[PDB]
Structure formats: C-alpha cells, structure tokens
Write a protein that binds this ligand. Sequence first.
Ligand SMILES: [Ca+2]
Ligand SMILES: [Ca+2]
Ligand SMILES: [Ca+2]
Ligand SMILES: [Ca+2]
Lengths: 81, 81, 147, 147
Amino acid sequence: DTQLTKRVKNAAANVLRETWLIYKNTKLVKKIDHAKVRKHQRKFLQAIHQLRSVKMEQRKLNDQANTLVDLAKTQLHHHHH
Amino acid sequence: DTQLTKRVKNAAANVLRETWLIYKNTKLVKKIDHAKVRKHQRKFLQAIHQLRSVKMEQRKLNDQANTLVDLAKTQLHHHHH
Amino acid sequence: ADQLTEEQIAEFKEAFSLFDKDGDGTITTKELGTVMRSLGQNPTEAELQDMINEVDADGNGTIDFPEFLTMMARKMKDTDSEEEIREAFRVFDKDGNGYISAAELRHVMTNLGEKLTDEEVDEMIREADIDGDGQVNYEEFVQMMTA
Amino acid sequence: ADQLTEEQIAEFKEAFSLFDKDGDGTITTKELGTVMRSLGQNPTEAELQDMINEVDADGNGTIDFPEFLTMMARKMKDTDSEEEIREAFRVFDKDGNGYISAAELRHVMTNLGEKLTDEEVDEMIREADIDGDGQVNYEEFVQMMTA
Ligand SMILES: [Ca+2]
Ligand SMILES: [Ca+2]
Ligand SMILES: [Ca+2]
Ligand SMILES: [Ca+2]
C-alpha cells in the first residue's frame, strides 16, 4: 500500500524533526523556552502515535491475510498460518 | 465495552468447542472423518482469528487513550505515556 | 514436504472456489469481503484492497489463481497454537487459579458460541478431568490436545 | 512526585480546554474526534464511544473533569522512547547499515513531514555527526538525545 508507506515516511520524518527540536530546545540553549518545548512535545507525540497506528494496521492486515491462508489450508491438526 | 467482551466470550467458547471437536475427531475415533475435521478446522481458525481481532482492537483502543494522556501531559523530555 | 505436491495445488484450486463465489475465475474485493465476514472478521474497503494489492501481479485489481499462489508460498509454515488455546480457556477461569470446574465448563459450553450439547460436554469432561476430581487443569488439557 | 501536585491539576485543567472546544464543561465524542484527528489519528465512532465509556462515571455519555482524572491516575507512569525513535531513523537507513549520510538526512528533512529548513538541518547534523565523517550513526545519536 502506497498510502500506508506515505504515512510512515511523513510520520518518521516528523519524529526526527521533533526529537531534534526538543533536544535543541532543552539541551543546546541558554534559556529553555517551555512554550516551545510544549509545542514540539505535542508534535512529537503526534508523530510517534502515527507510527504506532501504522504498525498496528500492518499487524491487522497481516492477520487478515493469515486468515485467508488458514482457510485455504483447510482444503489440504491445531496448527495455524 | 460490552460488545467487545461479548465478542471475546463467544469466540473463546468456540475455540474450546472446535479444539475439543478436532481432538475428538483426530485422536478419539476409530475412523477419522476428514470432512468433519475440515469443517471443525474452519470453525477453529475463525474463532482463533476473532480473538486475535479483539486483542488488536484492544491494543488500538489503549494507544488511542495513551495519545489523549500524552497530549494532556504536555500541559505539565522525550518520555511517553 | 518441500513447498509443493501436486495434491496440494489440487486442493488449493478447491480453495479458490471457496473465494470465487461466481466462479468467474477471479476474486474481487466484494467476494473477499463476503468470505472474510463469513469468518466473523470485518475488513474495511481499504483493507480488502490492500489484501489484493499485496499480490496483485497484473494490477487489474483482482486476484487470479496464479497470484493466489505467491501469497501462500510466502507463508506455508505453520506453528503450534498451544498458548492461544490456553488463553481462550483462561477467559473462563473466574478466579485465575488454573482450574475451571466441570459445572462451569457445562455452563459455558451450553450457552456461549455455537455451543455443545450436554452429552458432548460429558465426553469433553471425561477426557479433560484427568484426576477425576471434577476440575479441569486447562493448561494440562491443552498440552495434551496439542502434544 | 507522588501521584499529585496542585500544580499538575492546574495544568490538567488547561488540558481539559484542549479537549472541551465549546468549553461547555464536558467533552463529547464529537470534540474528542476533532482533537484525535488534529493529532493525525482516525478513531471510529465506536472507538470514540469506547474511550468515553472507559471512564464514564455517571454514564451520561460524556467526560467531565472529575472523570478526566481517573483516566490519568491510571497511567501517570512514563517510559523512555529510545527504541521507537531509533526505529523512526531506521526508516531512512537505505542500506540497513546503521548510518544515514548527511546528504540523505538533508534530502529527508527538507522534503518529508513538516520539514526543517536547510539551516536547521545544518544545526542537527553538527550535533549528530560526532566523528565529522559526514555520516550519522543514528543509534548513537538517539542514545545521546535520550540519555
Ligand atoms: Ca468471482
Ligand atoms: Ca492481479
Ligand atoms: Ca464541550
Ligand atoms: Ca460520564
């Protein structure tokens, strides 16, 4: 799926973006601007949770395909796949 | 959610049902009736995959709630929850 | 034994028929949806399109027999279901003590799911209650059925 | 430090406002939906109802401040994000060798997501390229940012 891949690339680039910005604003500055940290922490959690959402949808997709494969294999115990 | 719980109880009872029936028809019988085994294997994979579906939806629900909690916590680094 | 037997291919063709409702030679998202729901699953339209796209060779939007083989080849391997079955029993282990009574087993099996008759429940309990104490140690019983 | 500080409660009230759009004192599935999507997530109607039902005290179908506290109390604990961040970098590790070049990092960061400016990319690379070899060992860089 191109849509899912697209979701991953954009979300992953944003995890890099916000991790960098949080680090910069909380370790490479003389005066920590909390307002800025909060903004980037919001964008950081959003990107991390988007990647988690894609991973869960991929596990769902995989089990749907394994269900088709299991049903096909019945035409051939308690084992599955 | 009562709907999800209901899905679990019915699906779990069916995993017990079909595991028993597959075992009976493939170990406690003089003549193994493959047609019967196939039928029960189909019902077995259906129940096992329904329980997997509930588990994945519960992990999804949990991360959606953890997203709300993470966003709320921004009003208070790279840690999450 | 080694990825192929002319017997399997034969059965897999019978399988294709479990999917190709109209037997028009191709499986559409609509037919896949019907089969998946017949298995108590509920794939969205996008999920159905993704299943097909995963093995969509000639990218015509449908799955034909040849394509229905790469999807299988990629996952011929099976694995034991012991732990998952034990987890299904644990749903009915009220006190989380590892046992389910013969009475609770009848109460579950004659009311939930597709159900077993009281007579079928007697046969299951005869095999599961190894100690004859009216209690089923389910981890042991599942180990025996999957051994 | 121990489940509570009058300062947190204050901030959490400010949080409630991030959710209660109309500030009518209650969060509905509709408002929750708007916020969740503003975070790039897409909960279904049932998932929104489930989030509310999970902590729906007076079962009125909406979440009020008091209820908005049991949900938090139950998960105050945080955990480090090292591994997840490393995985995000690995998305851009073309050859799976543990490194991403300074050029590839600019190509990713100035085109994907919300983006960084070329000047911001220079600052990130200055910190990430520890050896000065134009290559970023990302496992090391993430370890340093999360240490
Ligand atoms: Ca057809
Ligand atoms: Ca095709
Ligand atoms: Ca409101
Ligand atoms: Ca309520």
